[PDB]
Design a binder for these strands. Structure first.
Lengths: 100, 55, 51, 267, 88
RNA sequence: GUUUAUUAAAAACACAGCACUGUGCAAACACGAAAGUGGACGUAUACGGUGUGACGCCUGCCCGGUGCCGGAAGGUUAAU
RNA sequence: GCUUGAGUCUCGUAGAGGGGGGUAGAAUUCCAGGUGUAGCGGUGAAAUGCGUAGAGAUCUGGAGGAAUACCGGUGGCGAAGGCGGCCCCCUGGACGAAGACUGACGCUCAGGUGCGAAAGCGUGGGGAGCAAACAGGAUUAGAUACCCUGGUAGUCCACGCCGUAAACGAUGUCGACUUGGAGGUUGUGCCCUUGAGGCGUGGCUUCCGGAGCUAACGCGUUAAGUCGACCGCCUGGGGAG
RNA sequence: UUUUUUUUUUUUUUUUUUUU
């Protein structure tokens, strides 16, 4: 129930696969009774540093009322996704119900 | 300043040396000051505060 | 640290990067670093400068 | 051998400190499925493998391939192998069958032992590496794609997967990190079973080496009738090589089938 | 750290009349039960010196508390060890 | 100890660890003219070089010569 | 019988966390092929290598080695040592509190119990970049040498006999000490919260105030001026560790 | 907080008594 704050970064152009992939990642959270403050499409943003050779990602940001019980099964299903550039997590000091 | 929304309005508190300014200019209250110190941190690592010119 | 000059007579508009990220980054390293002893020296320096 | 369960040697009240004090892994009878090896060196005729001593070879554990992957199983008991130092288990396949599988340090409960193409991932019978994740531990590895495993022991020998290496052509081991064997070969997991049986000497001598073989003990030394030295007088003291074939560094190969070794850093 | 299905019975069966919920016999019965509770999950986490102290702590005070009740009130002390033992 | 029965009776030394070494593997060895039988029902912590000299430390040091081989910047000068 | 020394529950809280888990990123080696004609390092002055078998470099494509750079402080924790990225679990110490319930269950310690900077023993190894040793060309009154390219160990350490030195109020246990005010700081009660903190208050730290005390630098109440429970250590030169 | 322009130059015997 740690009010996690988690970003990840797919390949910039797979815009038809990211919505079927967004259903498929909330899946873990919902299958655990965890609840979602926000789930932001960030978009096709360009990069700070030279990673993955398309010069952009497509990001997501979300805020989850969920337990430690899923954070590795997310760190797993990001790190085994051959098309995911980077991902990170932050926790607590309340949620963020309002967008960026 | 506890959270992200007002720190997107407060991007003037950044030096031409690209970092978060020493407050002598205006002297902020140590409570109001310490709140912004954590909201800067979370914004720095997500990159909603894009740290300096190139990034 | 990426500076445009323009109609290039060589303008020297590149001056202002001396502010920190070009230069003041070397107060540790020179061939070699200082290594031993600079770390309270950092606040030793303040009791030299009060005027 | 900092590890546990270790079994550390005895207080000196007998001639023996070693052997290995491992209670709880010899057993009898030799169960129904067993076989043996036979005669002595007997090559037809004049045997090149020196010293022999060939009595009690004797018996071996019979299960090679182990290719039943998909059908789940459980752990009955675990044993030992006097031919390899190997930690092997007796495995009951929930279909109706009993089998002998090569194991890590204490794999019991009787756990969930299964494999299958992308379907499973646990320490599993034999299992294809282009369908599971990346680590140090892998174990069985068909010495080439359908022939049979490379390692019949869990003696410590980590083979180490690399992720996407020149398109599936993987591993990173000891003496040739350019094996380039494709990940279409079969794993099982994993390489430390009983390090305790091998990482330390069992004796000086022991049952392991004098009840049914003689090891090597000389070549050069005594009776000049076999090796390139020499006169007499206790002396030795010349240049005397392992002739016509060599010793201390040269290499031996130039051409073979498959031949996959490429860069070779050696030393 | 035990269940309220346990605290709420400890209370009843080692209290006197009213509000004994924190007195020397109800304190022994809560320490005793909590020490024994902890024995049933201590086999996990495997490096756990960071928690084993405050357990050592409570089960050293359990001994001290008892030897203190002896010196103060012998005929409470006896009755209490006739039910729970803990004499170690 | 019983191991060179045949000068010695061991005052011989068979332990056994290991840095290094031969095999990324139709492996090293080829005995038989065709074996693939030792090793193998097995992988470079399996088996062999040359040894080791309880155990435990300790291997300082120093590359002239001379070995061990490896290589190619380059000449001595070949079947090609 | 009490002052409540002492605890447990209960309610709250924030960082460079005791020990297992995960891992965000400069440089720059050497190679696979893209190129440019010859000179890169290095110094008191340059060297042994290298260069019509093209001195680096610098893109493009690969293979290895796993520093913590910094919201970073004009600082924060901590018994010391001792990390700095943030974090999963076990969750040191806290320690700010309405209360609740028992009544000194209390202080402080020798031989001991643990921890234990430098270092040996390690058993198998993880084997970047620097630099004692290692290797040399050099500057040579002998260099037995500093360079300067090459250079390990030290980087840390699963596990563990670790005494131990430089961890000096040159110094432990502390209770009253109530002329005090002056800062650095920090949890915080009260204000039309008009405020750059005004009326306040405990803590963690320092500034430097009498009567005394008193060599000369002055130290000036928690501090050496009174006053106390010892677990010590204190046997003078050279005998010595 | 980079501070190697050479390293070394034998012994003595200097001393105008004392109580204040």
């Amino acid at each position: 129930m740690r009010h996690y704050e988690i970003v990840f970064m797919v390949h910039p152009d797979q815009s038809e696969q990211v919505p079927g992939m967004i259903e498929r990642y909330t899946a873990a959270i919902t299958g655990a009774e965890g609840k979602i403050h926000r789930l932001e499409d960030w978009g096709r943003r360009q990069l700070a540093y030279p990673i993955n050779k398309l010069h952009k990602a497509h990001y997501v940001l979300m805020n989850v009322e969920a337990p430690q019980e899923v954070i590795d099964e997310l760190e797993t299903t990001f790190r085994f996704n051959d098309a995911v550039i980077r991902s990170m997590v932050m926790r607590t000091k309340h949620a963020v119900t309002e967008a960026s | 300043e506890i959270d992200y929304k007002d720190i997107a309005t407060l991007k003037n508190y950044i030096t031409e040396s690209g970092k978060i300014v020493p407050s002598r200019i205006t002297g902020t209250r140590a409570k109001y000051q310490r709140q912004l110190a954590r909201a800067i941190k979370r914004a720095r690592y997500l990159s909603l505060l894009p740290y300096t010119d190139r990034h | 640290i990426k500076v445009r000059e323009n109609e290039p007579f060589d303008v020297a508009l590149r001056r202002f990067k001396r502010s920190c990220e070009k230069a003041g980054v070397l107060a540790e390293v020179r061939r070699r670093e200082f290594y031993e002893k600079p770390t309270t020296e950092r606040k030793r320096a303040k009791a030299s400068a009060v005027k | 051998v900092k590890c546990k369960p270790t079994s550390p040697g005895r207080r000196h009240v007998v001639k023996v400190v070693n052997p290995e004090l491992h209670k709880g892994k010899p057993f009898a009878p030799l169960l129904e499925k067993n076989s043996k090896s036979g005669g002595r060196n007997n090559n037809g005729r004049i045997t090149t493998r020196h010293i022999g001593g060939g009595h009690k070879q004797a018996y071996r554990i019979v299960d090679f391939k182990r290719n039943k992957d998909g059908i789940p199983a459980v752990v009955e008991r675990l044993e030992y192998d006097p031919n390899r130092s190997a930690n092997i288990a007796l495995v009951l396949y929930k279909d109706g069958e009993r089998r002998y599988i090569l194991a890590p340090k204490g794999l019991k409960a009787g756990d969930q032992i299964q494999s299958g193409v992308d379907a499973a991932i646990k320490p599993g019978n034999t299992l294809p590496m282009r369908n599971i994740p990346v680590g140090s531990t892998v174990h069985n590895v068909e010495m080439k794609p359908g022939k049979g495993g490379q390692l019949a022991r869990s003696a410590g020998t980590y083979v180490q997967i690399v992720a996407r290496d020149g398109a599936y052509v993987t591993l990173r081991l000891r003496s040739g990190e350019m094996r380039k064997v494709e990940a279409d070969c079969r794993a099982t997991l994993g390489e430390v079973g009983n390090a305790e049986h091998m990482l330390r000497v069992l004796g000086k001598a022991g049952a392991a080496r004098w009840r049914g073989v003689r090891p090597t003990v000389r070549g050069t030394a005594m009776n000049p009738v076999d090796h390139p030295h020499g006169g007499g007088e206790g002396r030795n003291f010349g240049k005397h090589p392992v002739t016509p074939w060599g010793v201390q560094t040269k290499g031996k190969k130039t051409r073979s089938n498959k031949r996959t070794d490429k860069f070779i850093v050696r030393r | 750290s035990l269940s309220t299905e346990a605290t709420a019975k400890i209370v009843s069966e080692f209290g006197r009349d009213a509000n004994d919920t924190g007195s020397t016999e109800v304190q022994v019965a809560l320490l005793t039960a909590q020490i024994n509770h902890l024995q049933g999950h201590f086999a996990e986490h495997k490096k756990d010196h960071h928690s084993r102290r405050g357990l050592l702590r409570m089960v050293s005070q359990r001994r001290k508390l008892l030897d203190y009740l002896k010196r103060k009130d012998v005929a409470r002390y006896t009755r209490l060890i006739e039910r729970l033992g803990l004499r170690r």
